[PDB]
Symmetry: C2
Subunit: 257 residues, 2 copies
């Protein structure tokens, strides 16, 4: 799905969000931090499905929420990948250098099913049993620091669930920025404001964005900016507290220098 130059641009966005949280995030964060964050998000993903046999039987999967949780994993996976790229070779943990088969047991659904390219995520993801096996595997990828592999898995999940991964990433990226501006660190952010969850507003912010537009080498920057603005406008954020893509790219290009 995603061209290399687009993925590089997403990483730059991720770098800027991470730096907003902590200027020297590479020096302060650890590979285990990102692995933990992914593990935690993966359980939020699974909680979108009616996996419990003792509660809410015959509930249908919250597939809309799944979009969000996939994008959250993606943020942490991009982060872990560049944490790895920045890790000196002699500080790379053994689990990430050993054969994958030696550090992971792979889980499979009972019923026959499509797979992603690797042997890890299963379709359709409308199916609870496919989702369970999928994200038990993701947690084991995380534990073995295979952030790049997790990234591929997410793109295929997004393909199957029939949503625009990149568009959703920019929307949530923007919300993540918004939360840091609005007291997320000090506990004053109202995440569920008047019964409504902040994530739930993001869907309407991406209805107007096409698959070709968000990945198109010429069009992507304008399209990402329009998602950004939609999200900032949805949260009543003043113009002067906003950033655009170019700005995130600029902050990354000087962070690299």
């Amino acid at each position: 799905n995603i061209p290399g130059a687009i993925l590089h641009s997403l990483a730059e966005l991720q770098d800027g969000l991470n730096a907003m949280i902590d200027p020297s995030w590479r020096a302060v964060r650890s590979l285990d931090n990102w692995a933990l964050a992914i593990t935690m998000e993966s359980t939020e993903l699974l909680d979108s499905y009616p996996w419990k046999w003792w509660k809410n039987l015959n509930a249908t999967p919250d597939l809309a929420n799944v979009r969000i949780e996939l994008v959250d994993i993606f943020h942490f996976s991009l982060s872990g990948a560049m944490q790895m790229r920045s890790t000196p070779d002699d500080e790379i943990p053994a689990a990430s250098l050993k054969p994958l088969k030696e550090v992971m047991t792979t889980f499979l659904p009972a019923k026959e099913c499509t797979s992603d390219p690797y042997g890890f995520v299963f379709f359709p993801l409308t199916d609870t049993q496919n989702a369970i096996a999928s994200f038990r595997n993701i947690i084991q990828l995380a534990n073995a620091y295979r952030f790049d592999v997790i990234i591929e898995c997410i793109i295929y999940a997004a393909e199957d669930l029939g949503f625009n991964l990149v568009a959703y990433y920019i929307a949530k990226h923007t919300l993540n920025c918004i939360r840091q501006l609005s007291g997320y660190k000090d506990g004053s952010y109202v995440k569920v404001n008047n019964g409504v969850e902040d994530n739930s507003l993001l869907h309407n912010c991406i209805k107007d964005v096409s698959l070709d537009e968000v990945l198109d080498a010429d069009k992507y920057v304008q399209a990402w900016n329009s998602i950004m603005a939609n999200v900032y406008e949805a949260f009543q954020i003043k113009e002067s507290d906003r950033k655009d893509a170019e700005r995130w790219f600029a902050l990354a290009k000087e962070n690299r220098l």
Copy 2:
């Protein structure tokens, strides 16, 4: 901490709760089900701690909630252990028969610390970094079906956090029963009723119970019955909808026949 005959009696309680959920639970449930449930609970446990570096900085650990989450893991671990005991030898998965070192990477805190007997959980559990390493290990035990090992870990955690594991188990066991009577399956249960979480009521139901009383070979049944009644009374449950220990033991003894 816990004598063998007491653990056997807890298993009988667990068997009865599981049968209330599904009469033939051994035939319908799988080892992966219990492993998944433990994985999910372990993330709820970790969410009691200020592990996030981007939210609610300098929050203190919800150690009271930790008690509950530990007991939830215990319920699923007892369940997995007797699922294993009931699994024909040729259906036992390889991960549970291989050397533990071959199916698990063990996580350690950075700072020096006490351990439980096995090499898996770290003290004090007032420390976020100890908790993180502890439950990343628990999830890997779960994935390798080491339910009995998880059980030992929980007893040592309870020792360090200075609470009565068995007393808390009976209280939550009773609440689990109460939820099944009150529409948990069909979605009509009010878990957060008037802003208050049901689990949060359980603490006052165990203040009057001592460590010696709940494990004492003569006294344990009366003590467990009094916790049971306290919990049923805390949720306004009519006498005729209650069960006592003897009753759970009786239901187990005929389920075995």
